[PDB]
Scaffold this active site. Structure first.
Site: not given
Length: 302
Positions: A131, A172, A209, A237, A239
């Protein structure tokens, strides 16, 4: 555990893996261990390898949780993605208190080198920098950027490469799910520039996400990320609020469609354990049974 393994199936489609985030607290209860052993081929420590957990005090490392995960992964033949070396969140106070350039630089390098060396040769990929971008595409003003300067990213990667040349080094980030969103376009251009300058950025990780209906956009976003020219890109990641089969399948196809996409990692096993549980965003329910989204992915990969 589901009879059909998304990892086995995605491997048959030519990809490297389909994994999940996890840690000791997950592997020691419920059906987590069994599910991962049967349906996933890669794991990312949810929290055990972060700075706050590994070096709460300078030079005083704690690898208890990290070791548990790495040893479990190796004993069970699962690939590992180290997560994460340089990040502004979950950062010990002793680090954010440093205002001296040389001091922070040496601290950041020692943290990177120490963790990577401990597991040298056993980690497929590391999220070196996490990030580092603002939503508008500019660099996030973190203690690293404000004390070391823009050079902290190149330094972090060069340092990581030296610590373990075997691992694929990743930058990332989240919100890289839309091809027209500022952030997406920005990380692509900056990674292009860094690699052109000789920085060893092997891949771009897109957290992914998602909220309901955002899967469709990934179909254009992932190929755009791959245009940066890194040898790899990955969904790190995943979801989705609502866990709609449509969103999950879209993301899976996006990776299938991108040659450089090596795999997908979903952020957790069962909904109750999600860090966004209120949105039941995972592939397994509270009873640890595969959800419609899991079966949809299986059906798509077969």
């Amino acid at each position: 555990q589901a009879a059909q393994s998304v990892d086995q199936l995605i491997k048959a489609r030519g990809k490297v893996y389909f994994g999940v985030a996890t840690d000791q607290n997950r592997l020691t209860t419920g059906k987590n261990a069994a599910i991962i052993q049967a349906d996933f081929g890669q794991v990312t420590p949810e929290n055990s390898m972060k700075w706050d957990a590994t070096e709460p005090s300078q030079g005083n490392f704690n690898f208890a949780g990290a070791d548990y995960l790495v040893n479990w992964a190796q004993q069970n033949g699962k690939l590992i993605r180290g997560h994460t070396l340089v990040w502004h969140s979950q950062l010990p106070s002793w680090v954010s208190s440093i205002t001296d350039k040389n001091t922070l630089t040496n601290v950041m390098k020692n943290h990177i080198t120490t963790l990577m060396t401990r597991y040298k040769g056993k980690i497929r990929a590391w999220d070196v920098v996490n990030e580092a971008f603002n939503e508008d595409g500019s660099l996030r003003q973190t203690v690293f950027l404000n004390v070391i300067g823009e050079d902290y990213i190149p330094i972090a990667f060069q340092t990581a490469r030296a610590a373990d040349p075997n691992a694929k080094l990743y930058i990332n980030d989240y919100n890289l799910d839309s091809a027209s969103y500022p952030k997406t376009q920005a990380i692509v251009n900056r990674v292009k520039q860094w690699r052109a300058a000789g920085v060893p950025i092997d891949g771009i990780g897109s957290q992914t996400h998602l909220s309901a209906g955002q899967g469709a956009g990934v179909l254009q976003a992932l190929p755009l990320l791959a245009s940066a020219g890194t040898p790899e890109v990955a969904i790190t990641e995943l979801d989705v609020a609502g866990a709609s089969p449509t969103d999950y399948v879209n993301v899976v196809n996006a990776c299938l469609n991108v040659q450089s996409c090596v795999g997908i990692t979903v952020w957790g096993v069962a909904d109750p354990d999600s860090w966004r549980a209120s949105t039941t965003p995972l592939l397994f329910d509270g009873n640890f049974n595969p959800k419609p989204a899991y079966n949809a992915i299986v059906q798509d990969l077969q």
